[PDB]
């Protein structure tokens, strides 16, 4: 307000496929990569950062405070506090909102906010301290257990997605159409070089030495409805299923970051920002339909901004499932030509902790590239939440 | 400022011993217990909570967003956003600072902040996705890996404690004296009923049915220097060791919570708060001496409050190791009769995610009970950080 | 025949309770203990042993050829071949029959035969070579998996025991009576010192140094029908159950051994043997009723010996379940005062690989102590087999 | 003697590569395949089998008595006893010797003897019964632990192989030459169809349905010394190494079986056997040089047969390591044109429990195919043993 918080820089790694191009790279090295890069791009010295805040969901086995590791690995001094927040899929966006708060209230001057996740590296879990006298014991998958299973209904996110498909009447055919659209938009954007600016290469040691990874791995080029309609429903196999692997996102690795400060601090430094942050909201809804979280979230953020929905030029609405993104667009009555125009997570992938910031990074570069003005990033969150941010291009 | 953020209520579970009285209780049930109770005590209806923020470090195997589970298990509606932060030992206090920020900036009206940890339930970890063709594979202890091992030097917190012992010249004899003091102060406080008010019983099913757990489990009554001086150093066994199990805290389970709102909202509701929050700080230091984090943290918080150190009536300085707490007190020149007067974590235990808020809960009730005015809660943090808060009794 | 194979010496360790007195002792050290001891007792130099043959069922994690380890640990040279056989519960007796064959045919001159098992040390199992992309994986209990589960019907031995109880009409009351009898006979034998001769102490390091273990651990003195009839059926909980923990044996650790050679070699050496081996049999039956294996086994061995059943003075019939031992005795019409007179495995325990030889050791010492002449050792075997041996006291 | 034991039939599966063509096939199904087939070939009804004896080393996770499972899966009745022996690498040959003994002494009339191993399916091991309060725990590889590690010196078989290389002066160049020879002989035999008769196809379900596997998988066609001499020593990397993957065998899956009875029983049935068994030996040597076990073993078997070494037309000497097979041939002064003429385990692979019988199967078919008369099968055994058999073609 008058001196709003602005985003000066924004970058992401490619999104790697499960057990794919980024699987050997610890999550904190993904974090370091984007942290170092956004500072570079903003021309901000690492010692001028007030704090680092990252979303990060599946942190088992990553060592003590992996954000701090990521921060220091980027060349930020030990003097700079660094910490993580978890709000499942919303975690990466929540990190940025939290920065908005510390800067707005006058506690931080410059913040590197973001999200990070290496799901390929998520371990299996065993409780061994008591000691099992006799009987089988599970090695539980932390991804499933901590990432993808609703704690209230003990069901996969994909089941909640079927609830939304049912209730918002998004057919199998609808979902496959959204999926094809998402895949084709991503392929068009890739070929047109639309992601080049936002991507920062990741360094990976191979048997044939060091390599740069700089193409998103998860897209399935040549996606078509005929192929997709042959697949069987994955979560719900009693003949009422609609969600398949083709119309859902995946398990993925990646990180993203943004540099934030006040407009006045940007002016003082001779920086022109990507955008100003106008508003944001977090809301709660029923776990059984967590997918529709962004509906109340968007309506509140947009309202808080003094906007009507028509005023929004571009939406990024996390595409965890076609069933959910379709339902959100249908209920709000959004123009699909304004929503996920470079494609969404069905094509690009969904590294839980990173996605909130990743879609923001994309949003901001899309707005910039198209010379459009007003954007909304939003995500549904397991357990029944939604988060949304309003940004306006300077 | 003019309308400061106040703490209306504050409560904790007992602290359970490793694999002890609370080990069968999932961490989110510990959270629910304290959340429900602080609302009860503040007379605030659960549907009036703007959000829930909890510190939580070892979240592997706890399911999707265990704070949200804890929130809902306390009777807070699905409409109320709930999420976690991780800043190792500082996590529980960081949760409260974050609430201060959301309330200060006008985003939240009422917040339940806190921390929670069941270390007994922390699993072992195995990476099984690639597949090991031939050879041994570790089942890594998440407590050690993610909780207690410095990521920069690959050494136990207890090793960093020896660095501080060495550098601040805190002898074995000094450490054992601090340990005895801590144990005796805790035993005196227990017998005098000083913890009765702050403790909320935990419900536990046993073979002989339901029981209430309401005594802290970890204290070793009759602690004496003669016994302690017989023990061997645990981390550093080359004849230069000082830290033993008797002069370090433990692995422990527990939770704690506070209810926060603006002074004006408290006045409107006819509530008298425990205290107002005057200031807080987070700082970074070298990982090798993470223990001395609270020195810069305290100095900055106290300075920001407009106080001198003499102005502080009561300190709670987390007693992870006698070596560290002694070093902090020595360097700042604090009166030991003002520091951890009900005893500290050597006697009480250290459930990582909970401790930041737990010491705050104790602080506030001590200030209340003694009719003293100004308090400081502070903790060192693995990886090289410190966090401190200033509170003033209304 | 004319120059029959004789048993010169026979010894056993105590039988340890699951996770009890012998759990820290590797199975091969149990083997070494009994091997060394029987050589000592027979006055046979270790370098005169032709070969060592031991039954051993649960060998996972025991290292390369644990019989060979056991042999060498007893002071038998590297020049002496040593190897194991597996025939589940019959394994320890099968080892002795196999020795009878190598000596009878003229391939071996002196053989140490026996059985050994540390079930406390049996590991859990995980298949990790492929690599599990996503999902839970079992840590399977090798005891259950490889020891106690019928491979044909995928059911616990205790289920097959219920089949025999049903079909041979052995009531819950019958089973509990057999159990009390077994417990009381064992307690009487212990107090009378009847096991003193056959037991060889095991050496175990404790925190208070080295100790000798020389009392069987599993017996429940003061066993009574009133207590037993209060227990619930363990395997079959649909209201048709009869088998409980009180009328079944346990999971147990132990070893036993015997020294064998021809009568002529014994005469040459100035040794008087415990007994001569007269006959033995191995038979197959249906897995669903594996418990009744000893019926055809005994009938064939006794027939091969030229005996009638009345001619047998003493039987040892492995008491895996009261339901099975009762059924065997009922069908064959045996005098219960001739069967398991020092008690059986319900009281003493059942270390799978050892039991076949353990009951033989006991048989031989009982025959000796009572001055009786003709004995039968027999066991049922998981998967549907029976094994029996006839011995005659010289 | 006068009525010697004869082998009527002999068959093997292909040998599968680690995690290769047979990895999804449980070991007992490999057993059933060869058991059923040898009965078929001998024209012996399954109900006429007196007993089944198989070598089997890595039995963890295979269920109760996997030989019995294998027997019944081949259509052998429940009435036929079936059991396993373990003598590490010698296990498959020991099974046959044991049959010789039961038939020779008049206890069995017809025996199916053999060996079987699925090393791909060998699990990792964890001891979980006590309960680990705090710290890392190993998931131990049962292959390494129970199969490939000398229990006396705690070193890989490959280390003992280096001891033999050193002591018998078998150079790196020598070993690579033996390896190339073995690979080229196997490739020549394959192309000439020499294994066709002995191989029995294994049935495997694939995504594209059922398939027959009938080519040995492990051979590396086009093996050459130039390639081999580029490899680095695998076990001993201090610059004194000679053993590499190219001049050692592998980890492999397979089974083999033979049908045995007396010559008189063969005559009565109108069967002409492959060969008569003339003699066999088992011996012990120092674990550090277990590889040279076959030297004393062969000398004793050949001596017991009334043969000189020149009398042996064909040897099969298990080729665990070129270093060992070379050393055996050098010391005994054998013609390399008489030794492993279809190639050995360097090319064919080494499924521990199966190999003893596998080389016997090959021996017998080679003797038959070449119209040669006298053969020797022999193997070294971990822990310091050797086993050898003499056969003579009828």
Short mmCIF file of N, CA, C and O in Angstrom, two decimals, chain C residues 153-218:
data_model
loop_
_atom_site.label_atom_id
_atom_site.label_comp_id
_atom_site.label_asym_id
_atom_site.label_seq_id
_atom_site.Cartn_x
_atom_site.Cartn_y
_atom_site.Cartn_z
N UNK C 153 -1.19 -74.07 1.90
CA UNK C 153 -2.45 -73.47 2.30
C UNK C 153 -2.29 -72.07 2.82
O UNK C 153 -3.27 -71.44 3.18
N UNK C 154 -1.06 -71.56 2.86
CA UNK C 154 -0.80 -70.22 3.39
C UNK C 154 -1.47 -69.99 4.75
O UNK C 154 -2.19 -69.03 4.95
N UNK C 155 -1.23 -70.91 5.67
CA UNK C 155 -1.75 -70.76 7.01
C UNK C 155 -0.71 -71.21 8.03
O UNK C 155 0.16 -72.07 7.73
N UNK C 156 -0.80 -70.61 9.22
CA UNK C 156 0.07 -70.90 10.34
C UNK C 156 -0.05 -72.38 10.70
O UNK C 156 -1.12 -73.00 10.52
N UNK C 157 1.05 -72.96 11.18
CA UNK C 157 1.01 -74.32 11.74
C UNK C 157 -0.15 -74.50 12.75
O UNK C 157 -0.75 -75.57 12.84
N UNK C 158 -0.42 -73.46 13.53
CA UNK C 158 -1.50 -73.45 14.51
C UNK C 158 -2.87 -73.67 13.87
O UNK C 158 -3.74 -74.26 14.50
N UNK C 159 -3.05 -73.22 12.62
CA UNK C 159 -4.27 -73.55 11.89
C UNK C 159 -4.31 -75.03 11.56
O UNK C 159 -5.34 -75.66 11.79
N UNK C 160 -3.22 -75.61 11.05
CA UNK C 160 -3.22 -77.06 10.79
C UNK C 160 -3.50 -77.88 12.05
O UNK C 160 -4.01 -79.01 11.97
N UNK C 161 -3.12 -77.33 13.19
CA UNK C 161 -3.29 -77.94 14.50
C UNK C 161 -4.78 -77.99 14.88
O UNK C 161 -5.29 -79.01 15.37
N UNK C 162 -5.47 -76.88 14.62
CA UNK C 162 -6.93 -76.83 14.73
C UNK C 162 -7.60 -77.86 13.81
O UNK C 162 -8.58 -78.49 14.22
N UNK C 163 -7.08 -78.09 12.59
CA UNK C 163 -7.64 -79.14 11.73
C UNK C 163 -7.54 -80.51 12.37
O UNK C 163 -8.49 -81.30 12.33
N UNK C 164 -6.38 -80.80 12.96
CA UNK C 164 -6.18 -82.07 13.66
C UNK C 164 -7.04 -82.16 14.94
O UNK C 164 -7.57 -83.21 15.25
N UNK C 165 -7.15 -81.05 15.67
CA UNK C 165 -8.00 -81.01 16.85
C UNK C 165 -9.43 -81.38 16.50
O UNK C 165 -10.03 -82.22 17.13
N UNK C 166 -9.94 -80.75 15.46
CA UNK C 166 -11.26 -81.00 14.92
C UNK C 166 -11.43 -82.45 14.50
O UNK C 166 -12.32 -83.16 14.99
N UNK C 167 -10.55 -82.90 13.62
CA UNK C 167 -10.69 -84.22 13.01
C UNK C 167 -10.45 -85.37 13.98
O UNK C 167 -11.06 -86.43 13.84
N UNK C 168 -9.52 -85.20 14.93
CA UNK C 168 -9.25 -86.22 15.95
C UNK C 168 -9.99 -85.93 17.25
O UNK C 168 -9.74 -86.60 18.26
N UNK C 169 -10.89 -84.95 17.21
CA UNK C 169 -11.73 -84.57 18.36
C UNK C 169 -10.93 -84.42 19.67
O UNK C 169 -11.15 -85.12 20.65
N UNK C 170 -9.99 -83.50 19.65
CA UNK C 170 -9.25 -83.13 20.83
C UNK C 170 -9.79 -81.78 21.23
O UNK C 170 -9.57 -80.78 20.56
N UNK C 171 -10.53 -81.77 22.33
CA UNK C 171 -11.21 -80.58 22.78
C UNK C 171 -10.24 -79.56 23.36
O UNK C 171 -9.09 -79.86 23.65
N UNK C 172 -10.74 -78.36 23.58
CA UNK C 172 -10.01 -77.33 24.29
C UNK C 172 -9.58 -77.85 25.67
O UNK C 172 -8.46 -77.63 26.10
N UNK C 173 -10.50 -78.55 26.32
CA UNK C 173 -10.29 -79.07 27.67
C UNK C 173 -9.19 -80.13 27.64
O UNK C 173 -8.30 -80.11 28.47
N UNK C 174 -9.27 -81.06 26.69
CA UNK C 174 -8.21 -82.04 26.45
C UNK C 174 -6.82 -81.40 26.30
O UNK C 174 -5.86 -81.87 26.90
N UNK C 175 -6.76 -80.31 25.54
CA UNK C 175 -5.50 -79.67 25.16
C UNK C 175 -4.89 -79.00 26.35
O UNK C 175 -3.68 -79.05 26.55
N UNK C 176 -5.75 -78.37 27.14
CA UNK C 176 -5.32 -77.69 28.34
C UNK C 176 -4.86 -78.72 29.38
O UNK C 176 -3.87 -78.51 30.06
N UNK C 177 -5.55 -79.85 29.47
CA UNK C 177 -5.08 -80.93 30.32
C UNK C 177 -3.70 -81.46 29.91
O UNK C 177 -2.85 -81.66 30.75
N UNK C 178 -3.48 -81.69 28.63
CA UNK C 178 -2.18 -82.14 28.15
C UNK C 178 -1.16 -81.06 28.53
O UNK C 178 -0.09 -81.37 29.06
N UNK C 179 -1.51 -79.79 28.33
CA UNK C 179 -0.58 -78.69 28.61
C UNK C 179 -0.14 -78.61 30.08
O UNK C 179 1.05 -78.39 30.38
N UNK C 180 -1.10 -78.76 30.97
CA UNK C 180 -0.82 -78.77 32.39
C UNK C 180 0.07 -79.95 32.75
O UNK C 180 0.98 -79.83 33.56
N UNK C 181 -0.22 -81.10 32.17
CA UNK C 181 0.55 -82.30 32.40
C UNK C 181 2.01 -82.10 32.00
O UNK C 181 2.96 -82.41 32.76
N UNK C 182 2.18 -81.55 30.80
CA UNK C 182 3.49 -81.30 30.24
C UNK C 182 4.25 -80.35 31.16
O UNK C 182 5.41 -80.60 31.50
N UNK C 183 3.59 -79.26 31.57
CA UNK C 183 4.22 -78.26 32.45
C UNK C 183 4.59 -78.87 33.78
O UNK C 183 5.69 -78.64 34.28
N UNK C 184 3.67 -79.63 34.38
CA UNK C 184 3.96 -80.26 35.68
C UNK C 184 5.06 -81.33 35.61
O UNK C 184 5.88 -81.42 36.50
N UNK C 185 5.05 -82.17 34.58
CA UNK C 185 6.15 -83.14 34.37
C UNK C 185 7.50 -82.45 34.22
O UNK C 185 8.53 -82.93 34.72
N UNK C 186 7.51 -81.35 33.49
CA UNK C 186 8.81 -80.61 33.32
C UNK C 186 9.30 -80.04 34.64
O UNK C 186 10.49 -80.13 34.95
N UNK C 187 8.38 -79.51 35.43
CA UNK C 187 8.74 -78.91 36.69
C UNK C 187 9.25 -80.00 37.67
O UNK C 187 10.27 -79.81 38.35
N UNK C 188 8.56 -81.12 37.72
CA UNK C 188 9.02 -82.27 38.50
C UNK C 188 10.41 -82.76 38.09
O UNK C 188 11.29 -82.99 38.94
N UNK C 189 10.64 -82.88 36.79
CA UNK C 189 11.96 -83.32 36.27
C UNK C 189 13.09 -82.34 36.63
O UNK C 189 14.16 -82.74 37.08
N UNK C 190 12.82 -81.06 36.45
CA UNK C 190 13.76 -79.99 36.83
C UNK C 190 14.17 -80.04 38.31
O UNK C 190 15.37 -79.96 38.66
N UNK C 191 13.17 -80.17 39.18
CA UNK C 191 13.39 -80.17 40.61
C UNK C 191 14.12 -81.44 41.02
O UNK C 191 14.95 -81.42 41.92
N UNK C 192 13.85 -82.53 40.33
CA UNK C 192 14.52 -83.78 40.59
C UNK C 192 15.91 -83.87 39.94
O UNK C 192 16.58 -84.88 40.07
N UNK C 193 16.33 -82.84 39.21
CA UNK C 193 17.63 -82.87 38.53
C UNK C 193 17.79 -83.79 37.33
O UNK C 193 18.89 -84.05 36.88
N UNK C 194 16.69 -84.26 36.78
CA UNK C 194 16.70 -85.14 35.61
C UNK C 194 17.36 -84.60 34.33
O UNK C 194 17.79 -85.40 33.48
N UNK C 195 17.37 -83.28 34.15
CA UNK C 195 18.05 -82.65 33.00
C UNK C 195 19.50 -82.29 33.21
O UNK C 195 20.17 -81.86 32.29
N UNK C 196 20.01 -82.48 34.42
CA UNK C 196 21.35 -82.00 34.76
C UNK C 196 22.42 -82.64 33.91
O UNK C 196 23.37 -81.98 33.46
N UNK C 197 22.27 -83.94 33.71
CA UNK C 197 23.25 -84.67 32.98
C UNK C 197 23.27 -84.20 31.51
O UNK C 197 24.31 -83.90 31.00
N UNK C 198 22.12 -84.10 30.87
CA UNK C 198 22.07 -83.77 29.44
C UNK C 198 22.40 -82.32 29.12
O UNK C 198 22.93 -82.04 28.07
N UNK C 199 22.08 -81.40 30.02
CA UNK C 199 22.40 -80.00 29.81
C UNK C 199 23.91 -79.71 29.89
O UNK C 199 24.66 -80.25 30.73
N UNK C 200 24.35 -78.88 28.95
CA UNK C 200 25.66 -78.27 29.02
C UNK C 200 25.46 -76.75 29.09
O UNK C 200 24.70 -76.18 28.28
N UNK C 201 26.08 -76.10 30.07
CA UNK C 201 25.95 -74.66 30.23
C UNK C 201 26.41 -73.88 29.01
O UNK C 201 27.33 -74.28 28.33
N UNK C 202 25.73 -72.76 28.75
CA UNK C 202 26.16 -71.85 27.73
C UNK C 202 26.75 -70.63 28.39
O UNK C 202 26.22 -70.12 29.38
N UNK C 203 27.86 -70.18 27.83
CA UNK C 203 28.55 -68.98 28.27
C UNK C 203 27.95 -67.74 27.59
O UNK C 203 27.78 -67.72 26.36
N UNK C 204 27.60 -66.75 28.39
CA UNK C 204 27.00 -65.50 27.89
C UNK C 204 27.63 -64.29 28.58
O UNK C 204 27.69 -64.24 29.81
N UNK C 205 28.12 -63.34 27.79
CA UNK C 205 28.59 -62.06 28.33
C UNK C 205 27.41 -61.15 28.64
O UNK C 205 26.49 -61.01 27.84
N UNK C 206 27.45 -60.58 29.83
CA UNK C 206 26.42 -59.70 30.35
C UNK C 206 27.15 -58.39 30.72
O UNK C 206 28.38 -58.31 30.54
N UNK C 207 26.42 -57.37 31.17
CA UNK C 207 27.06 -56.13 31.67
C UNK C 207 27.85 -56.40 32.96
O UNK C 207 28.91 -55.81 33.19
N UNK C 208 27.35 -57.32 33.78
CA UNK C 208 28.08 -57.80 34.94
C UNK C 208 28.95 -59.03 34.58
O UNK C 208 29.07 -59.97 35.37
N UNK C 209 29.55 -59.00 33.39
CA UNK C 209 30.50 -60.03 32.94
C UNK C 209 29.91 -61.36 32.45
O UNK C 209 28.74 -61.44 32.08
N UNK C 210 30.75 -62.39 32.46
CA UNK C 210 30.41 -63.72 31.94
C UNK C 210 29.49 -64.45 32.87
O UNK C 210 29.65 -64.37 34.08
N UNK C 211 28.52 -65.16 32.30
CA UNK C 211 27.67 -66.03 33.09
C UNK C 211 27.38 -67.37 32.39
O UNK C 211 27.40 -67.45 31.17
N UNK C 212 27.13 -68.40 33.19
CA UNK C 212 26.65 -69.68 32.71
C UNK C 212 25.11 -69.76 32.74
O UNK C 212 24.50 -69.55 33.78
N UNK C 213 24.50 -70.07 31.60
CA UNK C 213 23.07 -70.33 31.55
C UNK C 213 22.86 -71.86 31.49
O UNK C 213 23.40 -72.54 30.59
N UNK C 214 22.15 -72.39 32.48
CA UNK C 214 21.99 -73.84 32.64
C UNK C 214 20.64 -74.27 33.20
O UNK C 214 20.45 -75.43 33.63
N UNK C 215 19.67 -73.38 33.16
CA UNK C 215 18.31 -73.79 33.48
C UNK C 215 17.45 -73.46 32.27
O UNK C 215 17.59 -72.37 31.70
N UNK C 216 16.59 -74.39 31.88
CA UNK C 216 15.64 -74.15 30.82
C UNK C 216 14.73 -73.02 31.23
O UNK C 216 14.26 -73.00 32.37
N UNK C 217 14.46 -72.12 30.30
CA UNK C 217 13.85 -70.82 30.60
C UNK C 217 12.35 -70.77 30.39
O UNK C 217 11.69 -69.96 30.98
N UNK C 218 11.84 -71.61 29.51
CA UNK C 218 10.49 -71.50 29.02
C UNK C 218 9.39 -72.09 29.95
O UNK C 218 8.21 -71.68 29.88
#
